[PDB]
Structures are given as C-alpha cells and as structure tokens.
Design a protein around this ligand. Structure first.
Ligand SMILES: Nc1ncnc2c1ncn2[C@@H]1O[C@H](COP(=O)([O-])OC[C@@H]([NH3+])CCC(=O)[O-])[C@@H](O)[C@H]1O
Ligand SMILES: [Mg+2]
Length: 468
RNA sequence: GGCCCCAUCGUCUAGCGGUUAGGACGCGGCCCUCUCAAGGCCGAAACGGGGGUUCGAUUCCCCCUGGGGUCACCA
C-alpha cells in the first residue's frame, strides 16, 4: 500500500514548513487509502528543545491533520521518537561495519576542521586503518564515529518522482558519519533505518533534502533494502525569496494561532503553495483537497509566503465558510485575553454578526469592537471633532429618543430619518456625530443596529455622557 | 566556488504547440451607502536573454542569466 510520514525535529517552535509538508503527506496517504505516520526526529541532543515535541504534535492536530501512528497514538512499529531507538541504529551501524559498507574514524573535531581547511571535506583517511586495529581501539573505548564507506569511484542514481532521474557522481557524495561518538545516529542513518522498519513507501519532504537522497539510496543498497519513492516539495520562502525563516517571516504555527488565524484558513492557504485545483477554485475544505490531489497539479517553484493573502483568506473564511455561531465561539478566547466580557450568547452573537465583514483575524474583533463590550473605549480626535460639530442637533434629538417606546432598528431609523428631514439636513449630519458618541469611533457598522444593540437605557445613558 | 533543483503579472498560480496568456491577493476607479468595511463592475500589471526543433512556440531541446538548496559528529 502507501505509507507516508512527517518527521519533525523538536528544536524550536512548531514550523509552518513542517505543517506544509505534513499536509501533502496526509493527502497522499489518504488519497491512496494508506497510512500517515509521525516520527519525532530528536537525535541532536545539543539543539533539542524540551516541550518542542508536544507543540508540533498539537499544531498538526490544530491544523486539522490526523495521523495513524505516532508518539501519542500508538502504532506497531514504535517507539516513534528516535531518542528511544538508539540501540537499533547501533545495531545497524555495526552491521554496515561488518558488511564493509562503513568504517570507524577516530579524528577529533579539531583535526576534522583542519582536514576540512586543507582539503575541504573529509578525505576518508580512516579507511586505511586495519579493521582489527579499529575494533581494538574501539573496545579500548577510544571515542570515534562510524562513517558511510562510499563506493569509490562510482555514480549514484536518485529518482525523484516529480523531476525525474538525477545521477550523482560519488565524488560528490561524502563518507558521511552514520553514528556520532556520543552513540547517537545522524539524520541519514536513522532516516533510512526507521523509514524501512516503519514501512514508508513514499518519502515526501522539502527540496532542501534532495541532494542528501543519494546518501540514502546508497544506505538502502548497503542494507539490501528496497528504496521508497521520493517526492521533493519546494521550500516556502521569505519575501526576499530565501527559504522562509524566523527573522524575516513568521514561521511559528503558534504565532498564527495566537494572532487569530483560523486553522482551516491557514491550511487552505498552505495547500495553495505549489498546488491548485483543476477549476482554479481557491477556497476548499481539507477533505476536498485530499480527493483532488494529484502530483500532476503540484508546481515546483519556491513560493513566497504572502501574509497579506493569508489574511484575505482568513477574512474570507470568517465571513463565508464558517457559520455565525462558529465565529462567535472562536472569538471568545480573544475577548477573554483582552479582558473583555460579553453579557450573553445572544449579545455576543449579534455583536459578532455586526462586525463579521470588518475583521480578518479573531484578534482584530476585540480591537475594533471594544466599545461594544466595555465603557473603557478610546475616542478618536476625528470622532471627537464630529461629536462637537453635532452637539446642537443631538441635544435636540435626545428628547425624541427618550420618547421612543419601540426601541427597534426599523423604528429608530424612521425616527432619525424624520429628525434629519424636519431639520432640513442630510442623515449623515446627525448619524456620524451620534456614531461618535455611541462608539468613540467613526468606522463602525450601521448606526441603527449599533443604536439598537445596547437597548434604550444603555444607548441614551452613553449618549448622555457625550451631551454632558 | 563544486554539485543539484527551479524559472508566466509585485505575490500565489492556470496553461501542458496555435489563447484577446485566464483566475486570485494586493493596487487604481466606479456602483452601493448614515460612516468604515463587505459585495458587484471596470482597469493597470507577466511569458528573463540567446540559439535551435517545428508551418507555428509561453509550451520541446541547448547554452547563458537569475533565484534556491547542499557541501557539519544540524537536520
Ligand atoms: N522552509 C521550509 N519550507 C518547506 N518545508 C520545510 C521548510 N523547512 C523545513 N521543511 C520540511 O518540513 C519537514 C520537517 O522538517 P524538520 O522538522 O526541519 O526536520 C525534517 C527531518 N527531521 C526529516 C526530513 C525527512 O527526511 O523527511 C521536512 O520534511 C522538511 O522538508
Ligand atoms: Mg494582462
């Protein structure tokens, strides 16, 4: 069948590039009724960040992805954390040693640096150490690493399903270390061992790994295992076209969640990086994406992540994909965070309804409609000027307002329309200043709905402080 | 610098020999209108350069250029 995986390294914030890749592995697996695996690649104890694992795992679920096997969902080929698989890599490294597909090298990092400075890269000098001597020095406990013994001279063919065949000359392939002197494996060794033991048949990862694939093809040969298919996706880019990074772009998935982007929208935007629906449609569900997925519709250029288009899509989701109620619910955390409270579900729902076409992120809602939940709201200088210019007619309208029994949008409008007419003046000449008094802003939703919202008492009560 | 990948509007992209080279974001205008948005309509905006192949290339091949990646006991 088809078995895919996402192999995040817990070394920092949950990365958007990881979400992007996970997304296509998930679709390919599901599209073929296969299995999507999560394997935590925590082999670099120096860069390992505690708490990073939970964060990427939580973020993948937040985005809407589900995995069939992994650290927290079980699976028949665990552990799904490489740090817990050390004896396994050890065993396989030693097997390569015995097959004469690798050798022990005992150079100190300082020496390797010198070698690199003199000849560039490693010259594979340790291959000249007698096998028995190497084993003896190993038993004595002399620190060392185990390196891949590349067949020299030679050539190595890699097959990328999206770009065709690429033939590397072994002189371009270094005798990479397979097992570090701390007993930990390097990415290359653990990747091939685990992909094979976990049954991965389709390796989908970012293009940054294409050049290292020949190393993997050689490892599969050394172990005598069948290589899986390889699909290298393009790298997400910063505005300047360099691969997306923390200092030039927001690469943390937690940042997106904290900023009020809907996971559904972010995921939908991510699907547009290197992929498109047959009919050009831009808004679609995760399930629709799975069904339409085809490698024929995947484009290879490096896409720049456009925060602006993402915000547009998030606003699109907010007003046309989700229902009023879903938005109302997803807005609560952000109200709380802003220290704002809402009277009841009915009030909140109506407030969200009035602001729906006016906010692209859940975070903008508490910011642009603060005056709807608290008396602690700012009044713009421009709102203040409009308020003063209209004080005279408001003073006159005030009593009419307090005379209104049916405090309804339909009624209030008729009342105001009349007041502006009998005063031989345009509605705006009264609407704008009333808006400023009611909200402290001159950019809000319709006046009648804003006036109606709080109810007679609250409306006039606030109007009074203004006329005061 | 060596090797490898890539190349249509500013950005994401459709196209897969013949099109007025289409859509979307963003940008400009108009409509709508009590403000601001939302929405509708209109508009400006691209095939990097040079050779080929072919009746005919945005599309097929080659070089150049540009961008990206990789040359760690990081992944
Ligand atoms: N800027 C970027 N744009 C697009 N994709 C990006 C990316 N940065 C990382 N990736 C990709 O996300 C996945 C996770 O990467 P990572 O957590 O850095 O470690 C990935 C490696 N541990 C395993 C790679 C593999 O063999 O599949 C990987 O599969 C990697 O390709
Ligand atoms: Mg045009």
């Amino acid at each position: 069948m088809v078995v895919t995986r996402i192999a995040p390294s817990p070394t920092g914030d949950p990365h958007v590039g990881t979400a992007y890749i996970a997304l296509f592995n998930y679709a390919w697996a599901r599209r073929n009724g296969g299995r999507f695996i999560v394997r935590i690649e925590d082999t670099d104890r120096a860069r390992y960040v505690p708490g990073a694992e939970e964060r990427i795992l939580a973020a993948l679920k937040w985005l809407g992805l589900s995995y069939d096997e992994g650290p927290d969902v079980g699976g028949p080929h665990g552990p799904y954390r490489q740090s817990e698989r050390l004896p396994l890599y050890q065993k396989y490294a030693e097997e390569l040693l015995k097959r004469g597909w690798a050798y022990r090298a005992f150079e100190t990092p300082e020496e390797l640096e010198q070698i690199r400075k003199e000849k560039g890269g490693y010259d594979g000098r340790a291959r000249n150490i007698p096998p028995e001597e190497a084993e003896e020095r190993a038993r004595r406990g002399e620190p060392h690493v185990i390196r891949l013994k590349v067949p020299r001279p030679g050539t190595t063919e890699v097959k990328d399903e999206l770009r065709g065949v690429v033939v590397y000359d072994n002189q371009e392939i270094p005798d990479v270390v397979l097992l570090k002197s701390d007993g930990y494996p390097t990415y290359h060794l653990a990747n091939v061992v685990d992909d094979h033991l976990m049954g991965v048949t389709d390796v989908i990862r970012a293009e940054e790994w294409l050049v290292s694939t020949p190393i993997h093809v050689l490892l599969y040969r050394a172990f005598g295992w069948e290589a899986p298919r390889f699909y290298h996706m393009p790298l997400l880019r910063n505005p300047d076209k360099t691969k997306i990074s923390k200092r030039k772009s927001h690469t943390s998935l937690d940042w997106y969640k904290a900023e009020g982007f809907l996971p559904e929208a972010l995921r939908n935007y991510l699907c547009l990086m290197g992929f498109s629906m047959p009919d050009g449609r831009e808004i679609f569900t995760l399930e629709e994406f799975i069904q339409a997925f085809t490698w024929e519709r995947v484009s290879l250029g490096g896409p720049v992540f456009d925060l602006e288009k993402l915000r547009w899509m998030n606003g699109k989701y907010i007003r046309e994909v989700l229902s009023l109620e879903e938005v109302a619910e997803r807005v609560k955390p952000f109200l709380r965070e802003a220290g704002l409270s809402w009277e009841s579900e009915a009030y909140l729902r109506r407030a969200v309804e009035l602001m729906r076409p006016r906010f692209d992120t859940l975070k903008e809602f508490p910011e642009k409609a603060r005056y709807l939940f608290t008396e602690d709201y700012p009044v713009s200088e421009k709102a203040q000027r409009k308020l003063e210019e209209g004080l005279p007619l408001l003073k006159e309208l005030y009593p009419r307002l307090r005379a209104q029994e049916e405090w309804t949008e339909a009624a209030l409008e008729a009342l105001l329309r009349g007041f502006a007419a009998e005063k031989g003046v345009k509605l705006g000449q009264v609407a704008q200043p009333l808006r400023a008094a009611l909200t402290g802003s001159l950019e809000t939703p319709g006046l009648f709905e804003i006036l109606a919202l709080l109810g007679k008492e609250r409306a006039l009560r606030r109007l009074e402080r203004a006329l005061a």
